[PDB]
Amino acid sequence: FDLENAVLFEVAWEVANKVGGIYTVLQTKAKVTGDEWGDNYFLVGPYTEQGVRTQVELLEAPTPALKRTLDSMNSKGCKVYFGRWLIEGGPLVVLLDVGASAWALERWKGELWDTCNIGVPWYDREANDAVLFGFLTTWFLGEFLAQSEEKPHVVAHFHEWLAGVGLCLCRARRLPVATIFTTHATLLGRYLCAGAVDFYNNLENFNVDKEAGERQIYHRYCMERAAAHCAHVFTTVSQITAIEAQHLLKRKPDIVTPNGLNVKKFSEFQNLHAQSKARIQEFVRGHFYGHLDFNLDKTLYFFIAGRYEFSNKGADVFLEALARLNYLLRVNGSEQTVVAFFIMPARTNNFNVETLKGQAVRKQLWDTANTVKEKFGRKLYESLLVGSLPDMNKMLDKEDFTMMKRAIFATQRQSFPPVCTHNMLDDSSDPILTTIRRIGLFNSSADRVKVIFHPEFLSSTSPLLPVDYEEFVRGCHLGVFPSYYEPWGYTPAECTVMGIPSISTNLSGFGCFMEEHIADPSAYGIYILDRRFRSLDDSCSQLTSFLYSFCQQSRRQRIIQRNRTERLSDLLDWKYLGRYYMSARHMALSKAFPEHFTYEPN
Template sequence: MPLTRSLSMSSLSGVLPQWEDDELPVNDLLLFEASWEVTNKVGGICTVIQTKAKITVDEWGDNYYMMGPYFEHNFQTQVEECEPPQPAVGKALEALRNNGCQVHCGRWLIEGSPYVILFDIASAAWNLDRWKGDLWHSCHIGLPYHDREANDALIMGALIAWFFKELTDELGDRLNVVGHFHEWQAGPGLILCHFYNNLHTFDIDKEAGDRQIYHRYCLERAAVHCAHVFTTVSQITAVEARHVLHRQADVVTPNGLNVKKFSAIHEFQNLHSICKSRIQEFVRGHFYGHLDFNLDKTLFFFIAGRYEFSNKGADIFLESLARLNYLLRDVTVVVFFIMPAKTNNFNVESLKGQAVRKQLWDTAHSVKEKFGKRLYDSLLKGQIPDMNAILDRDDFTIMKRAIFATQTQPAPITTHNMLDDATDPILTNVRRVGLFNDRCDRVKIIFHPEFLSSTSPLLPMDYDDFVRGCNLGVFPSYYEPWCTVMGIPSVTTNLSGFGCFIEEHVSDPSAYGEDLHRGPAFRSADDSCNQLTQFMFSFCQQSHRQRIIQRNRTERLSELLDWRYLGRVSVSLDLRQQLGKHTRVSKVRLNRAYCLQFGFTQV
């Protein structure tokens, strides 16, 4: 299958000089980064581009733009509309608007406030059939009518290519343009900007055809071979790309994080405690009426990302949790699955649980105030209060009514109403392994089929805060490119980018997490499940002090993955070395059919 979340392709226009100094001449360059997830949260790529935005803006300033699709809700809630600082960019955008294509520009309201250019797919859909024909005549890639995602990707790619043509015509020789394209959805833009047709030399990937994604694979493969610089986020995806896409990665650019450093260890630990208490409050509501386990002896595990059941290792994880359930005695583990799926609303029982929890809190505070006042009055009189009389009948009535309100069925597995409950992979396997949140179960499951947000009425926490409040992240993934290292230990695989990175740069990975081998190339699925089960069981047996020590070690490790280090190395050094090789590149080169369509002269 295509390496759709692991690759990035870079192209450029203009004549680039050989750079011999140590600094990239960003004043003479415009950098455009294209991704389907700019202002559009779909998976991990959105987190990648968000977290490295500040370090890129610090280095490139107003010469840096992100490009993606326009969605009205995302634009209204995340973007402050404004005009671009370069007149040439503004004129290129205006040229598209004058031809009936809607395009929006503004500042993305994230750290760094980068400029974004968002293309309205629907406004240009009138030309889809022609662009499909051009794609077929140019490189023999056909897109089926029913694949809306691929069709939308082609429209955005055509608009990006059109924009670049207008921009380079306006700029002339004043500035050079660098384009950085993420994932296969952004690939059509690179293909239409710069394409040479040599696909006939490649063998057709039967597996892609069997999975009915051959056209997507072809788009990605063509984009890879059109790029001047081809990068992957790990050595493992570089190996896959060499065999599947028939091109060796020029540069491996690991993904990083915005790492918040603390002046003292206790500040970091206090933040973990605060975030954990917020998760505990949610758990109290979710398990109301069945909160028969000690939250002080409860650990929080999580897995998060795109809902790809096998690729993300949710199958391995669930099987291992079922085995862990038989081993645990005194410790309870609450496991969160944070993976977006099709839902129609919040689960009524989940919302009711949080309402009941709030009611109990208010009742307890009301009784506490009465109790405290009467106790205080009695002590002022020099009397030891009669504890049986200090609370009257009404107080007991209020408390009993609150207790009766907590009587309910076992806590729900999901926080939302699932549209495909009967066929959902996670729920189907939960039924298979029998983890139903019964009182006897020491492993409890909470499936949250939506990305986390601080504005949620159910679990009002941003992802970063949620992760900090958990005890362990579990990522038995085939292609997980990075893991959120915010002082939280994690277990991952040596088949993922993050696992390989840690294996290469850390002498003792077991002090921070476990390198879990999985897959037929290394060991059987059963062996992988046993290994993961044993790791989680050993983690549960650690003392509170041991977990604190491990979190401190992991927090120190996070500096290795900071964008302040990886971003400058990747952007400056690698681009200087790789892009500097291309000294005979002219302006954006469009394929002939595309140029004829818009009346351009091919350059």
């Protein structure tokens, strides 16, 4: 509860260099942890030149004790820096360089072998970097404690596998400080999923050592497992990750600490929805030019986003389910048409000729309509000025009839709009395209489900859909994320904070979290697919049922659903989720050296 001397050290590889989602977590955790630990909040992270200049303002030590520590570290051939990260909460950051590897080979690495009976191969860059980072962090905190008046309470919070070398050493060197190790993902889990046929059900069966060795990832696994065993308190991002940790690391998580996002989505919630849908609607009109028999107010947009993974984000399940939805919409006649946007980022050369031309024709038609509109404007104004209702036939001059005739000639096409927006450098290989062809969704006139795959992260610079990810997300009606393995659903979480209803799965961490925290997922607009306890085909059928239910929702009902989701943002806010880590931190102090601070669980 109360920290007399406690100092919080959130040690992570992604403090200063954006490499993965962990970086967003820290950048977002920093504000709330800032309040609880005050100026005792120190971030231990790798130095990146580009990172430091853009994000960090260099500073001097607040504490004379710290000054001594910084000086000592600087002295013995290490180039540690201290500064204030300019992110919210202004945390003090100690960014040590991993470029100062003066003695790392056969001295630091040598030591690690004697201490933890672990070795890192020369070729692996990430582990080699992490050993340097780990040793430096252990040295820093050990030196700090020694040079300063002894604070019985410090907390070092290690937030990833590669920061875990430090935790192994810290506990081994018998430094008197409680350390929390948090696995935002299981290392072996990522490889085992997709790599193996049935990762989830055979969790217990798998001989972790054998699998890890087989993938030449054994050193990394050993480090992750060592860190887990070493930590007094072990935390995991989600309950699903906890199940993985129990079997793969052979250690139950002591506490499960969910990831959170700050609400910066307010800058509305419905106005932005409308504006975004309009922009999306413009792209659709352009892309489908000439084959615009679909009612464009009745059309619903569904999207799947994130990094590029076919198995992990279960794009296959979404595509199979879309084919089944197409069948249902065809057999039972619906004015509504579904447009599915797959925004997974594959290799692209340029916008496809057809796609670019489509957008250009939309531009031409809009420009023409403007020219004719202005001329009608003048003629109407002139006609009104004389006191006569416009004689409609005479309003349009022969000059425009030619311009408009040319415009309607441009629209004419007999070829279905392309299934991708970008010309793919590698087309035939593309899993999404192969599946679209197999599934039979070729954007045919007859089809009620139209699939548009945008393989580039949506950008302001891009000519088509020149909206950034957040704005596009706001425009879409629904977001479908049938994730198989990906631990915490950062993308689904963002969607829900925005108020887009989002399909999640039991296998996704965000999905499991929502099930635990919400008695009915469906009512609040977050659908849960039970992919853990269902077969693949039955899961697809379940998704089809969800998608179809959404399609057959009344306009008013959908509005209600959206508004309900906007309430679920608080579940993912750091304010509420701050409780879980604070609990972990307090528990850490108690696990070792309990005499100074002992606090009993709520």
